[PDB]
Design a protein around this ligand. Structure first.
Ligand code: NAG
Ligand code: CA
Length: 886
């Protein structure tokens, strides 16, 4: 007491008809707010700041509800003050929660679960407390600096206008890179020099200084870093991969180069990054992780990188000019785990709203990246504009002409402005495009000539418009704001069509990324139309894990394409995530520095020695087995690594964990298991190499994925035959297999769900609890249900980004299999026929849990012995001994 019965108002961001937000606070138990969408929270203003003692919640029925309650005394920070997570039914008495005299002017109530419906509701909410006499402040409006006003602009222009300064900056940065990669104590062992290009091509040199130091020349920062990398790999037996295992143990004495080497590349561009990489991998990266990535990029010859960092600020400034408040902009933009599909015009809103602090922090991060990219000579690919607008754009701008784009995986696509209109009509494409390109300038300045945009990506609608004309006008608009503009276009599943592409009047100022060149190349159509294009290895889909690579194709098809083309302007990587199969990515970028086919087998032999720091005949034998099995050339169509049955929704006839995935293992499982045996035999000798431990975990989890598929078959067979005792035994072994898998996965920091989640929760500084919880939602949802019900199920996205991760395996994958198996067992045992399980309901329950109230996942890997774990797998849990195991 006392109850707050005067002056209290409420908002919501969605409701079903009739069931408006104000109905949560009208004193009437028979009327309710109800949610219409993925915003399932209301915000209550109390008409002043009160020290709260009690909050009372009534629901419309007797379902089981779960919810989190947040309070704010400053109007900005919403911190968690109470929650319901127990399985108690709601009833006519309501739920009463004690707060401990927390000051609050506003309250948020996020109802994350209703056992009866996808929709949530609040019939009534009563707030009790003592008036402080005070009122909330305003919220000051979102304010960001203009680039030209920042120290970043001064530095960018100085580098541009002063050669001596630029060279000193670059050379010093490359020295800083050496210190970060191998240690500060190695900086003075290298001398770096700028030189010119070799016959119009990027080039490096490595040689002896004459006094025991290493002289490295390069035409720019990336050539220099590539020379450093060449030295480490070829002379020091050192291998740098900050994401997927390194060997950084330097020799006692700096090895001599001997004969000087001069190495060039025939490719103008070496490209990195899918839009998807920004979501499946990079969602919650800090500057430390970005810096590491750029160092790896430069060392691997990368000079062209997709860049969407801080684009939310560009969009904010743009839409502010066409009748959108900052709050409406926040509702349009997705959450931090979904920018890939927001910028590809596939989805809106889901995962948001982003916090007010987001905009300045990301614009700063983007500026910081561009400074480092300038130093190295890496070209970012910024954004183009093709007509993307919110669905309410016409409501706010009545003369605008738009085309509804329909749905993508159950998400509402944003609208698209008609690229051209009739005489007499207002041309808002021209209006918004002009503003977009000018706002992008204001935020980041003139940092690139490369701009990426992709209308009609995985659907949409061209309406009444001419396809060729659409692409003509988009390109023309782009060139208008930058005369040297190059429109970077994705080639995905035969789109854009030839005659979209024939619409480009300036062929030399487009560049097409052939997205999937190592499995489904589609550059012939581009070469035929004199379109500059890049050969890309996609390789990774959704961050899904498993032993999978196409080394032979990379070693052969790339120089073959160069020899058989005139418009191949680069090679690159387009992975949906960067988390898997390091061999593939290293070989890909090595292929930039040759015009000839190489031997993928002897390449691998050299690769593993520098990756582990040592090699022997047996380790070589194990890797040849991998080359003969999991990494063997194939000629079919497939999307990513063969999926683990452990990660699939339980069921009969399972052929995949994800809708567009596959579970078929196209190589002999028992042959592959020999690699694990050899690794186990050599464990104690190689255990001081982290990259060896990484690879051992990779192949062993693959062994267990492979054998689980066989055990799953047997157990389904035992069901179908009515054999209760056999099903119990085989399903028991199947569950024990998953438990062993969890132990294997626990050995790697990169396989911990706790790191993914903690990164999300800590990615900004001075976040409130609201933002941390919402970002955790983004992290949990992306790797499981992806979206809500209509996206996971009807939309086909369920388990699209499934991960063979610790914590996730035990609490999510294992839990699903356990439930289904008890159900079948209960039936076999003279039971209750087994229920249909509403899988999404169970999955989302896990999605919505919070690290500070439910269960905190560890950020620390285990000490388990992979050699000993391999032994158990071979003995108990393998295809090889499966007949003796049963
Ligand atoms: C759900 C998902 O990630 N879909 C991606 C899509 O966003 C991307 O444009 C494309 C090409 O890389 O491939 C799909 O697999
Ligand atoms: Ca009511």
């Amino acid at each position: 007491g006392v109850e707050i019965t005067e002056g209290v108002t409420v908002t919501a961001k969605g409701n079903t008809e009739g069931n408006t937000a104000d109905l949560a606070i009208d004193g009437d138990l028979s009327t309710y707010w109800e949610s219409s969408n993925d915003y399932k929270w209301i915000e209550v203003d109390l008409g002043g700041i009160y020290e709260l003692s009690k909050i009372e919640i009534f629901n419309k029925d007797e379902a089981v509800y779960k919810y989190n309650i947040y309070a704010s005394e400053d109007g900005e920070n919403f911190n968690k003050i109470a929650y319901k997570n127990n399985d108690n039914v709601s009833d006519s008495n309501g739920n009463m929660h004690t707060i401990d005299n927390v000051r609050a002017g506003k309250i948020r109530i996020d109802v994350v679960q209703n056992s009866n419906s996808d929709r949530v509701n609040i019939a009534e909410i009563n707030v009790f407390g003592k008036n402080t006499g005070e009122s909330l402040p305003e919220v000051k409006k979102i304010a960001t600096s203009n680039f030209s006003e920042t120290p970043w602009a001064t530095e960018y222009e100085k580098f541009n206008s002063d050669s001596a300064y630029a060279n000193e900056k670059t050379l010093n940065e490359i020295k800083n890179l050496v210190g970060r990669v191998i240690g500060r104590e190695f900086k003075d062992k290298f001398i770096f020099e700028i030189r010119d290009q070799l016959n119009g091509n990027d080039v490096f040199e490595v040689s002896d200084s004459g006094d025991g130091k290493v002289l490295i020349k390069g035409n720019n920062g990336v050539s220099l870093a590539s020379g450093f990398n060449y030295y480490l790999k070829n002379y020091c037996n050192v291998s740098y991969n900050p994401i997927m295992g390194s060997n950084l143990k330097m020799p006692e004495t700096m090895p001599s180069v001997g004969e000087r080497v001069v190495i060039d590349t025939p490719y103008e561009h070496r490209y990195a990054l899918n839009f998807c990489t920004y979501s499946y991998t990079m969602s919650f990266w800090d500057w430390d992780q970005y810096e590491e990535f750029l160092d790896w990029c430069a060392m691997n010859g990368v000079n062209l990188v997709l860049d969407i960092i801080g684009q939310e600020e560009v969009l904010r400034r743009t839409l502010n000019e066409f009748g959108y408040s900052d709050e409406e902009v926040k509702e349009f933009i997705s959450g931090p785990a979904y920018f890939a599909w927001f910028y590809m015009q596939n989805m809106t809103g889901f995962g948001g709203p982003l916090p007010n602090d987001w905009f300045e922090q990301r614009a700063e991060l983007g500026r910081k990246m561009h400074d480092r990219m300038q130093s190295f000579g890496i070209n970012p690919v910024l954004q183009g504009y093709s007509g993307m607008v919110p669905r309410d754009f016409k409501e706010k701008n009545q003369e605008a002409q738009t085309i509804s784009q329909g749905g993508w995986c159950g998400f509402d696509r944003p609208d698209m402005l008609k690229t051209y209109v009739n005489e007499g009509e207002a041309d808002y494409f021209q209006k918004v495009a002009d503003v977009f390109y000018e706002k992008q300038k204001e935020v980041f300045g003139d940092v690139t000539n490369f701009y990426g945009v992709d209308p009609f990506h995985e659907g949409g609608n061209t309406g009444d418009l001419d396809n060729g004309k659409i692409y003509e006008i988009i390109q023309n608009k782009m060139i208008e704001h930058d005369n040297d503009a190059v429109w970077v276009i994705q080639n995905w599943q035969g789109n854009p069509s030839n005659n979209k592409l024939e619409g480009l009047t300036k062929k030399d100022q487009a560049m097409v990324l052939d997205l999937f060149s190592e499995v489904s190349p589609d550059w012939n159509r581009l070469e035929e139309r004199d379109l500059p294009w890049i050969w890309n290895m996609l390789h990774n889909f959704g961050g899904r894990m498993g032993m999978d690579a196409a080394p032979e194709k990379l070693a052969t098809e790339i120089p073959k394409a160069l020899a058989n083309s005139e418009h191949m302007v680069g090679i690159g990587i387009t992975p949906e995530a960067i988390n898997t199969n390091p061999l593939a990515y290293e070989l890909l970028f090595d292929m930039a520095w040759t015009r000839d086919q190489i031997n993928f087998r002897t390449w691998t032999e050299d690769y593993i020695e520098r990756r582990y720091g040592k090699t022997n005949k047996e380790i070589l034998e194990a890797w040849n087995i991998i080359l003969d099995t999991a990494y063997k050339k194939r000629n079919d169509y497939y999307q990513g690594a063969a999926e683990s049955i452990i990660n699939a929704r339980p069921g009969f006839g399972i052929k995949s964990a994800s809708t567009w995935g596959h579970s078929k293992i196209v190589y002999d499982k028992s042959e592959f298991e020999k690699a694990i045996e050899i690794f186990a035999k050599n464990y104690d000798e190689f255990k001081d190499s982290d990259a060896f431990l990484y690879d051992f975990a990779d192949i062993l989890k693959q062994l267990l994925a492979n054998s689980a598929q066989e055990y799953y078959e047997v157990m389904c067979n035992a069901y179908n035959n009515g054999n209760g005792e056999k099903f119990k035994f085989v399903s028991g072994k199947f569950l024990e297999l998953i438990k062993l898998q969890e132990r294997v996965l626990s050995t790697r920091p990169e396989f911990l769900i706790g790191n993914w989640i903690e990164d999300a929760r800590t990615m900004l500084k001075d976040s409130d609890d609201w933002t941390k919880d919402l970002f955790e939602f983004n992290a949990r949802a992306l790797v499981t249900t992806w979206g809500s019900r209509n996206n996971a199920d009807g939309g086909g996205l369920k388990d699209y980004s499934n991960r063979q991760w610790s914590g996730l395996t035990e609490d999510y994958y294992y839990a699903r299999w356990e439930k289904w198996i008890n159900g079948l067992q209960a039936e076999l045992d003279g039971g209750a026929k087994a229920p249909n399980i509403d899988w999404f309901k169970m999955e989302y329950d896990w999605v919505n849990k919070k690290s500070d109230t439910d269960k905190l996942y560890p950020t620390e890997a285990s000490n388990e012995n992979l050699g000993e774990l391999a032994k158990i797998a071979m003995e108990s849990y393998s295809v090889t001994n499966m007949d003796k195991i049963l």
